[PDB]
Design an enzyme around this catalytic site. Structure first.
Site, PDB file in Angstrom:
ATOM      1  N   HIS A   1     -10.204   2.934 -23.385  1.00  0.00           N
ATOM      2  CA  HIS A   1      -9.555   2.060 -24.354  1.00  0.00           C
ATOM      3  C   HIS A   1     -10.534   1.688 -25.458  1.00  0.00           C
ATOM      4  O   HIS A   1     -10.218   1.837 -26.653  1.00  0.00           O
ATOM      5  CB  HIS A   1      -9.018   0.784 -23.646  1.00  0.00           C
ATOM      6  CG  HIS A   1      -8.161   1.068 -22.446  1.00  0.00           C
ATOM      7  ND1 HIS A   1      -6.976   1.775 -22.521  1.00  0.00           N
ATOM      8  CD2 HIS A   1      -8.310   0.747 -21.139  1.00  0.00           C
ATOM      9  CE1 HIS A   1      -6.418   1.853 -21.322  1.00  0.00           C
ATOM     10  NE2 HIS A   1      -7.219   1.260 -20.458  1.00  0.00           N
TER      11      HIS A   1
ATOM     12  N   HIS B   1     -16.905  -6.070 -26.324  1.00  0.00           N
ATOM     13  CA  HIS B   1     -16.284  -4.829 -26.777  1.00  0.00           C
ATOM     14  C   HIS B   1     -15.732  -5.084 -28.188  1.00  0.00           C
ATOM     15  O   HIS B   1     -15.713  -6.220 -28.676  1.00  0.00           O
ATOM     16  CB  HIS B   1     -15.172  -4.372 -25.819  1.00  0.00           C
ATOM     17  CG  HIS B   1     -14.052  -5.370 -25.762  1.00  0.00           C
ATOM     18  ND1 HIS B   1     -14.070  -6.467 -24.927  1.00  0.00           N
ATOM     19  CD2 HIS B   1     -12.934  -5.501 -26.526  1.00  0.00           C
ATOM     20  CE1 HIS B   1     -13.000  -7.218 -25.168  1.00  0.00           C
ATOM     21  NE2 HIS B   1     -12.297  -6.672 -26.148  1.00  0.00           N
TER      22      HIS B   1
ATOM     23  N   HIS C   1     -12.524  -3.751 -31.234  1.00  0.00           N
ATOM     24  CA  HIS C   1     -11.294  -3.105 -31.640  1.00  0.00           C
ATOM     25  C   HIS C   1     -11.500  -2.638 -33.074  1.00  0.00           C
ATOM     26  O   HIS C   1     -12.094  -3.364 -33.875  1.00  0.00           O
ATOM     27  CB  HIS C   1     -10.087  -4.089 -31.560  1.00  0.00           C
ATOM     28  CG  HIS C   1      -9.929  -4.747 -30.214  1.00  0.00           C
ATOM     29  ND1 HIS C   1      -8.988  -4.356 -29.290  1.00  0.00           N
ATOM     30  CD2 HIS C   1     -10.608  -5.764 -29.607  1.00  0.00           C
ATOM     31  CE1 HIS C   1      -9.105  -5.082 -28.187  1.00  0.00           C
ATOM     32  NE2 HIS C   1     -10.078  -5.946 -28.342  1.00  0.00           N
TER      33      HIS C   1
ATOM     34  N   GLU D   1      -7.629  -7.421 -34.683  1.00  0.00           N
ATOM     35  CA  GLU D   1      -6.481  -7.926 -33.931  1.00  0.00           C
ATOM     36  C   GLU D   1      -5.980  -9.224 -34.563  1.00  0.00           C
ATOM     37  O   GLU D   1      -4.835  -9.310 -35.018  1.00  0.00           O
ATOM     38  CB  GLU D   1      -6.894  -8.079 -32.461  1.00  0.00           C
ATOM     39  CG  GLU D   1      -7.160  -6.709 -31.819  1.00  0.00           C
ATOM     40  CD  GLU D   1      -7.006  -6.706 -30.323  1.00  0.00           C
ATOM     41  OE1 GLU D   1      -7.615  -7.565 -29.653  1.00  0.00           O
ATOM     42  OE2 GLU D   1      -6.242  -5.840 -29.830  1.00  0.00           O
TER      43      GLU D   1
ATOM     44  N   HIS E   1     -15.261  -8.885 -29.588  1.00  0.00           N
ATOM     45  CA  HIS E   1     -14.867  -9.870 -28.590  1.00  0.00           C
ATOM     46  C   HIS E   1     -15.974 -10.009 -27.553  1.00  0.00           C
ATOM     47  O   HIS E   1     -16.273  -9.044 -26.831  1.00  0.00           O
ATOM     48  CB  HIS E   1     -13.576  -9.418 -27.887  1.00  0.00           C
ATOM     49  CG  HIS E   1     -12.384  -9.497 -28.785  1.00  0.00           C
ATOM     50  ND1 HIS E   1     -11.207  -8.788 -28.553  1.00  0.00           N
ATOM     51  CD2 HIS E   1     -12.215 -10.176 -29.952  1.00  0.00           C
ATOM     52  CE1 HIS E   1     -10.365  -9.075 -29.548  1.00  0.00           C
ATOM     53  NE2 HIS E   1     -10.942  -9.923 -30.379  1.00  0.00           N
TER      54      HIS E   1
ATOM     55  N   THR F   1      -5.694  -9.591 -25.049  1.00  0.00           N
ATOM     56  CA  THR F   1      -4.969  -8.742 -26.001  1.00  0.00           C
ATOM     57  C   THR F   1      -4.685  -7.354 -25.454  1.00  0.00           C
ATOM     58  O   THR F   1      -4.018  -6.560 -26.139  1.00  0.00           O
ATOM     59  CB  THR F   1      -5.683  -8.625 -27.338  1.00  0.00           C
ATOM     60  OG1 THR F   1      -6.864  -7.857 -27.116  1.00  0.00           O
ATOM     61  CG2 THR F   1      -5.982  -9.982 -27.964  1.00  0.00           C
ATOM     62  N   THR F   2      -5.151  -7.060 -24.244  1.00  0.00           N
ATOM     63  CA  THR F   2      -4.931  -5.822 -23.512  1.00  0.00           C
ATOM     64  C   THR F   2      -4.159  -6.132 -22.238  1.00  0.00           C
ATOM     65  O   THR F   2      -4.331  -7.219 -21.665  1.00  0.00           O
ATOM     66  CB  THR F   2      -6.286  -5.209 -23.118  1.00  0.00           C
ATOM     67  OG1 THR F   2      -7.137  -6.236 -22.566  1.00  0.00           O
ATOM     68  CG2 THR F   2      -6.980  -4.574 -24.316  1.00  0.00           C
TER      69      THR F   2
HETATM   70  N1  K5W Z   1      -9.379  -8.084 -25.807  1.00  0.00           N
HETATM   71  S1  K5W Z   1      -9.751  -9.376 -24.966  1.00  0.00           S
HETATM   72  O1  K5W Z   1     -11.004  -9.935 -25.412  1.00  0.00           O
HETATM   73  O2  K5W Z   1      -8.629 -10.249 -24.854  1.00  0.00           O
HETATM   74  C1  K5W Z   1     -10.104  -8.829 -23.319  1.00  0.00           C
HETATM   75  C2  K5W Z   1     -10.016  -7.473 -22.965  1.00  0.00           C
HETATM   76  C3  K5W Z   1     -10.339  -7.067 -21.678  1.00  0.00           C
HETATM   77  C4  K5W Z   1     -10.755  -7.977 -20.718  1.00  0.00           C
HETATM   78  C5  K5W Z   1     -10.840  -9.308 -21.078  1.00  0.00           C
HETATM   79  F1  K5W Z   1     -11.189 -10.233 -20.159  1.00  0.00           F
HETATM   80  C6  K5W Z   1     -10.544  -9.707 -22.344  1.00  0.00           C
HETATM   81  F2  K5W Z   1     -10.674 -11.029 -22.632  1.00  0.00           F
HETATM   82 ZN    ZN Z   2     -10.702  -7.443 -27.123  1.00  0.00          ZN
END
Ligand code: K5W
Ligand code: ZN
Ligand code: K5W
Ligand code: BGC
Ligand code: GLC
EC number: 4.2.1.1
Length: 257
Positions: free
Chosen positions: A61, A91, A93, A103, A116, A195-196
Protein backbone atom coordinates in the site's frame (compact mmCIF):
# COMPACT_ATOMS: atom_id res chain seq x y z
CA UNK A 1 -7.94 -7.51 -0.97
CA UNK A 2 -8.28 -3.79 -0.63
CA UNK A 3 -6.15 -1.32 -2.55
CA UNK A 4 -6.36 1.99 -4.42
CA UNK A 5 -7.29 0.90 -7.97
CA UNK A 6 -10.62 1.21 -9.74
CA UNK A 7 -11.68 -2.27 -8.69
CA UNK A 8 -10.56 -2.35 -5.03
CA UNK A 9 -10.16 1.31 -4.06
CA UNK A 10 -11.88 3.76 -1.69
CA UNK A 11 -15.31 3.50 -3.36
CA UNK A 12 -15.38 -0.28 -2.74
CA UNK A 13 -14.03 -0.44 0.82
CA UNK A 14 -17.45 -0.12 2.50
CA UNK A 15 -18.48 -3.62 1.31
CA UNK A 16 -15.91 -5.27 3.61
CA UNK A 17 -15.48 -2.38 6.11
CA UNK A 18 -18.95 -0.84 6.62
CA UNK A 19 -17.52 1.77 9.04
CA UNK A 20 -16.28 3.45 5.83
CA UNK A 21 -19.66 5.26 5.91
CA UNK A 22 -19.40 6.04 9.64
CA UNK A 23 -19.76 9.18 11.71
CA UNK A 24 -16.07 10.11 12.21
CA UNK A 25 -14.20 9.06 9.05
CA UNK A 26 -10.93 10.54 7.80
CA UNK A 27 -9.51 12.36 5.93
CA UNK A 28 -11.62 15.55 5.75
CA UNK A 29 -11.36 18.91 4.05
CA UNK A 30 -10.08 21.56 6.49
CA UNK A 31 -12.11 24.75 5.94
CA UNK A 32 -9.68 27.27 7.41
CA UNK A 33 -12.34 29.97 7.80
CA UNK A 34 -14.69 27.72 9.82
CA UNK A 35 -11.93 26.23 12.01
CA UNK A 36 -11.94 27.98 15.40
CA UNK A 37 -9.11 28.79 17.84
CA UNK A 38 -9.44 26.58 20.93
CA UNK A 39 -7.97 28.04 24.16
CA UNK A 40 -8.34 24.72 26.01
CA UNK A 41 -5.57 23.20 23.86
CA UNK A 42 -2.35 22.78 25.86
CA UNK A 43 1.11 23.24 24.30
CA UNK A 44 1.96 20.41 21.87
CA UNK A 45 5.08 18.36 22.69
CA UNK A 46 6.82 16.31 20.01
CA UNK A 47 9.65 14.48 21.84
CA UNK A 48 11.62 12.42 19.30
CA UNK A 49 15.23 12.87 20.57
CA UNK A 50 15.47 9.22 21.70
CA UNK A 51 13.61 7.63 18.78
CA UNK A 52 14.84 4.18 17.70
CA UNK A 53 14.00 3.37 14.08
CA UNK A 54 14.35 -0.27 13.08
CA UNK A 55 13.17 -1.23 9.58
CA UNK A 56 11.46 -0.01 6.41
CA UNK A 57 8.77 -2.23 4.81
CA UNK A 58 6.86 -2.10 1.50
CA UNK A 59 3.45 -3.39 2.64
CA UNK A 60 1.83 -3.27 -0.81
CA UNK A 61 0.00 0.00 0.00
CA UNK A 62 2.81 2.36 1.05
CA UNK A 63 6.11 1.96 2.91
CA UNK A 64 6.31 2.03 6.71
CA UNK A 65 9.34 3.17 8.71
CA UNK A 66 8.99 1.21 11.96
CA UNK A 67 10.15 2.19 15.47
CA UNK A 68 10.96 0.32 18.67
CA UNK A 69 7.78 1.05 20.67
CA UNK A 70 8.60 -1.26 23.62
CA UNK A 71 9.30 1.87 25.74
CA UNK A 72 8.58 5.62 25.63
CA UNK A 73 11.14 7.03 23.70
CA UNK A 74 9.55 8.78 21.10
CA UNK A 75 6.30 10.33 22.31
CA UNK A 76 3.64 12.90 21.47
CA UNK A 77 1.93 14.74 24.33
CA UNK A 78 -0.04 17.91 24.91
CA UNK A 79 -2.29 19.79 22.50
CA UNK A 80 -5.65 17.98 22.47
CA UNK A 81 -4.16 14.83 23.98
CA UNK A 82 -4.83 13.35 27.42
CA UNK A 83 -1.76 11.28 28.27
CA UNK A 84 1.23 9.91 26.37
CA UNK A 85 1.23 8.52 22.82
CA UNK A 86 4.16 6.42 21.59
CA UNK A 87 5.47 6.52 17.98
CA UNK A 88 5.09 3.15 16.20
CA UNK A 89 5.62 4.01 12.52
CA UNK A 90 5.45 6.65 9.82
CA UNK A 91 4.38 6.42 6.18
CA UNK A 92 3.27 8.67 3.31
CA UNK A 93 0.43 9.05 0.79
CA UNK A 94 1.27 10.53 -2.62
CA UNK A 95 0.05 11.11 -6.16
CA UNK A 96 0.90 10.24 -9.75
CA UNK A 97 1.56 13.98 -10.33
CA UNK A 98 2.31 16.92 -8.01
CA UNK A 99 -1.29 18.27 -8.11
CA UNK A 100 -2.70 15.46 -5.96
CA UNK A 101 -1.58 13.00 -3.30
CA UNK A 102 -2.62 14.39 0.09
CA UNK A 103 -5.51 12.90 2.04
CA UNK A 104 -6.49 15.98 4.02
CA UNK A 105 -7.13 19.09 1.93
CA UNK A 106 -6.94 22.76 2.97
CA UNK A 107 -9.83 24.84 1.57
CA UNK A 108 -10.12 21.98 -1.00
CA UNK A 109 -6.45 22.35 -2.08
CA UNK A 110 -4.62 19.05 -2.57
CA UNK A 111 -0.89 18.81 -1.73
CA UNK A 112 1.60 16.54 -3.54
CA UNK A 113 1.85 14.17 -0.54
CA UNK A 114 1.12 13.75 3.16
CA UNK A 115 3.27 12.24 5.95
CA UNK A 116 1.57 10.38 8.84
CA UNK A 117 3.44 9.74 12.12
CA UNK A 118 1.30 7.15 13.95
CA UNK A 119 1.23 6.96 17.78
CA UNK A 120 -0.71 4.84 20.26
CA UNK A 121 -1.98 5.76 23.75
CA UNK A 122 0.18 4.03 26.34
CA UNK A 123 -2.68 3.68 28.84
CA UNK A 124 -3.92 0.77 26.66
CA UNK A 125 -0.65 -1.21 26.73
CA UNK A 126 -0.40 -2.28 23.03
CA UNK A 127 -1.41 -0.95 19.60
CA UNK A 128 -3.97 -3.76 19.21
CA UNK A 129 -5.83 -2.77 22.39
CA UNK A 130 -5.49 0.93 21.50
CA UNK A 131 -7.48 0.36 18.26
CA UNK A 132 -10.42 -0.81 20.38
CA UNK A 133 -10.63 2.61 22.07
CA UNK A 134 -12.08 5.99 20.95
CA UNK A 135 -8.85 7.75 22.04
CA UNK A 136 -6.43 4.96 21.13
CA UNK A 137 -4.35 6.69 18.45
CA UNK A 138 -2.90 10.10 17.57
CA UNK A 139 -1.66 10.75 14.03
CA UNK A 140 0.54 13.78 13.29
CA UNK A 141 -0.06 14.74 9.65
CA UNK A 142 2.33 16.93 7.62
CA UNK A 143 1.74 18.16 4.06
CA UNK A 144 4.43 17.95 1.37
CA UNK A 145 4.76 20.48 -1.46
CA UNK A 146 7.33 20.34 -4.26
CA UNK A 147 10.13 22.91 -4.22
CA UNK A 148 13.49 22.70 -2.44
CA UNK A 149 14.78 19.31 -1.28
CA UNK A 150 14.17 18.15 2.30
CA UNK A 151 17.58 16.95 3.53
CA UNK A 152 16.06 14.82 6.32
CA UNK A 153 14.03 12.85 3.76
CA UNK A 154 16.96 11.83 1.54
CA UNK A 155 17.93 8.72 3.56
CA UNK A 156 14.37 7.44 3.04
CA UNK A 157 14.48 8.14 -0.69
CA UNK A 158 17.80 6.40 -1.15
CA UNK A 159 16.68 3.10 0.42
CA UNK A 160 13.53 2.75 -1.71
CA UNK A 161 15.36 0.90 -4.53
CA UNK A 162 15.90 -1.96 -2.05
CA UNK A 163 12.20 -2.32 -1.16
CA UNK A 164 10.64 -1.90 -4.61
CA UNK A 165 8.00 -4.62 -4.29
CA UNK A 166 5.37 -5.75 -1.79
CA UNK A 167 6.80 -7.73 1.11
CA UNK A 168 10.36 -6.46 0.87
CA UNK A 169 12.01 -4.86 3.89
CA UNK A 170 15.40 -3.40 4.79
CA UNK A 171 17.27 -2.36 7.92
CA UNK A 172 16.55 1.29 8.70
CA UNK A 173 18.28 1.96 12.02
CA UNK A 174 19.54 5.34 13.24
CA UNK A 175 17.01 7.48 11.34
CA UNK A 176 15.98 10.76 13.03
CA UNK A 177 12.31 11.65 12.30
CA UNK A 178 12.87 15.19 13.63
CA UNK A 179 14.29 16.00 10.19
CA UNK A 180 10.83 15.55 8.61
CA UNK A 181 9.11 18.36 10.54
CA UNK A 182 8.50 21.98 9.43
CA UNK A 183 9.58 24.93 11.59
CA UNK A 184 6.14 25.71 13.04
CA UNK A 185 3.94 23.43 15.15
CA UNK A 186 0.74 25.41 14.45
CA UNK A 187 -1.98 22.80 13.81
CA UNK A 188 -5.60 21.88 13.28
CA UNK A 189 -7.19 18.98 15.21
CA UNK A 190 -10.35 16.89 15.03
CA UNK A 191 -11.55 13.33 15.93
CA UNK A 192 -11.41 10.81 13.08
CA UNK A 193 -10.33 7.40 11.84
CA UNK A 194 -7.64 5.40 10.13
CA UNK A 195 -7.61 6.41 6.43
CA UNK A 196 -6.88 2.79 5.40
CA UNK A 197 -8.92 -0.37 6.05
CA UNK A 198 -9.97 -1.29 8.69
CA UNK A 199 -10.94 2.43 8.95
CA UNK A 200 -11.28 2.23 12.76
CA UNK A 201 -12.60 5.35 14.51
CA UNK A 202 -9.80 5.66 17.07
CA UNK A 203 -7.72 8.65 15.96
CA UNK A 204 -7.13 12.16 17.27
CA UNK A 205 -5.81 13.90 14.13
CA UNK A 206 -3.23 16.70 14.51
CA UNK A 207 -2.53 18.23 11.08
CA UNK A 208 0.28 20.81 10.88
CA UNK A 209 -0.50 24.03 9.01
CA UNK A 210 3.03 24.54 7.58
CA UNK A 211 3.93 22.14 4.73
CA UNK A 212 7.43 20.80 4.27
CA UNK A 213 9.11 21.28 0.89
CA UNK A 214 10.57 18.26 -0.91
CA UNK A 215 12.22 18.23 -4.33
CA UNK A 216 10.64 16.88 -7.50
CA UNK A 217 13.40 14.27 -7.61
CA UNK A 218 12.50 13.06 -4.10
CA UNK A 219 8.81 12.53 -4.85
CA UNK A 220 9.60 10.99 -8.26
CA UNK A 221 11.45 8.23 -6.39
CA UNK A 222 8.34 7.51 -4.27
CA UNK A 223 6.53 6.96 -7.58
CA UNK A 224 9.00 4.25 -8.67
CA UNK A 225 7.84 1.88 -5.92
CA UNK A 226 5.49 -0.98 -6.83
CA UNK A 227 2.19 -2.16 -5.36
CA UNK A 228 2.86 -5.66 -6.76
CA UNK A 229 5.21 -8.36 -5.49
CA UNK A 230 8.47 -9.49 -7.03
CA UNK A 231 8.07 -11.12 -10.42
CA UNK A 232 4.55 -9.84 -10.98
CA UNK A 233 3.49 -7.27 -13.61
CA UNK A 234 4.56 -3.78 -12.58
CA UNK A 235 1.89 -1.55 -11.00
CA UNK A 236 3.46 1.72 -9.90
CA UNK A 237 2.70 2.71 -6.29
CA UNK A 238 0.98 6.05 -6.95
CA UNK A 239 -2.31 7.65 -5.87
CA UNK A 240 -2.38 5.75 -2.57
CA UNK A 241 -4.67 8.35 -0.95
CA UNK A 242 -8.29 8.26 0.25
CA UNK A 243 -10.36 11.36 -0.69
CA UNK A 244 -12.02 13.63 1.85
CA UNK A 245 -15.01 12.20 3.73
CA UNK A 246 -18.10 13.93 5.19
CA UNK A 247 -17.41 16.06 8.27
CA UNK A 248 -20.76 15.17 9.88
CA UNK A 249 -21.09 16.20 13.56
CA UNK A 250 -17.54 17.52 14.00
CA UNK A 251 -15.63 20.78 14.43
CA UNK A 252 -12.02 21.42 13.48
CA UNK A 253 -10.10 23.36 16.15
CA UNK A 254 -7.01 25.50 15.56
CA UNK A 255 -4.04 25.86 17.90
CA UNK A 256 -3.37 29.41 16.70
CA UNK A 257 -5.32 32.65 17.00
N1 K5W B 1 -3.23 6.44 7.29
S1 K5W B 1 -3.33 6.44 8.87
O1 K5W B 1 -2.29 7.25 9.45
O2 K5W B 1 -4.67 6.65 9.30
C1 K5W B 1 -2.91 4.80 9.41
C2 K5W B 1 -2.59 3.79 8.48
C3 K5W B 1 -2.23 2.53 8.93
C4 K5W B 1 -2.16 2.23 10.28
C5 K5W B 1 -2.48 3.23 11.18
F1 K5W B 1 -2.48 2.97 12.51
C6 K5W B 1 -2.81 4.48 10.75
F2 K5W B 1 -3.09 5.42 11.69
ZN1 ZN C 1 -1.71 7.38 6.47
N1 K5W D 1 -14.08 -4.15 -0.25
S1 K5W D 1 -12.55 -4.31 -0.70
O1 K5W D 1 -12.15 -3.10 -1.38
O2 K5W D 1 -11.82 -4.80 0.41
C1 K5W D 1 -12.51 -5.60 -1.93
C2 K5W D 1 -11.74 -6.72 -1.69
C3 K5W D 1 -11.65 -7.73 -2.64
C4 K5W D 1 -12.34 -7.64 -3.83
C5 K5W D 1 -13.11 -6.53 -4.06
F1 K5W D 1 -13.80 -6.42 -5.23
C6 K5W D 1 -13.21 -5.52 -3.14
F2 K5W D 1 -14.01 -4.49 -3.42
O1 BGC E 1 -22.31 26.82 22.75
C1 BGC E 1 -21.16 27.56 22.33
C2 BGC E 1 -20.04 26.62 21.97
O2 BGC E 1 -20.44 25.95 20.76
C3 BGC E 1 -19.53 24.92 20.38
O3 BGC E 1 -20.01 24.33 19.22
C4 BGC E 1 -18.13 25.48 20.14
O4 BGC E 1 -17.21 24.42 19.92
C5 BGC E 1 -17.64 26.29 21.33
O5 BGC E 1 -16.38 26.91 21.04
C6 BGC E 1 -18.69 27.30 21.75
O6 BGC E 1 -18.30 27.95 22.96
O1 GLC F 1 19.13 5.98 9.02
C1 GLC F 1 18.55 5.11 8.05
C2 GLC F 1 19.60 4.51 7.14
O2 GLC F 1 20.24 5.59 6.44
C3 GLC F 1 21.16 5.13 5.46
O3 GLC F 1 20.54 4.22 4.62
C4 GLC F 1 22.31 4.42 6.16
O4 GLC F 1 23.23 3.96 5.17
C5 GLC F 1 21.78 3.26 6.98
O5 GLC F 1 22.82 2.71 7.77
C6 GLC F 1 20.65 3.70 7.91
O6 GLC F 1 20.02 2.57 8.47
Amino acid sequence: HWGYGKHNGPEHWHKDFPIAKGERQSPVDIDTHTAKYDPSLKPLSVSYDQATSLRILNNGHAFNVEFDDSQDKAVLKGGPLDGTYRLIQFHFHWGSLDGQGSEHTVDKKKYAAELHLVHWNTKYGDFGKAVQQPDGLAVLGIFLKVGSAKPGLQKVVDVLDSIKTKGKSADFTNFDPRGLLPESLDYWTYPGSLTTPPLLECVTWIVLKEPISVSSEQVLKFRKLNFNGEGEPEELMVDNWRPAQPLKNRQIKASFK
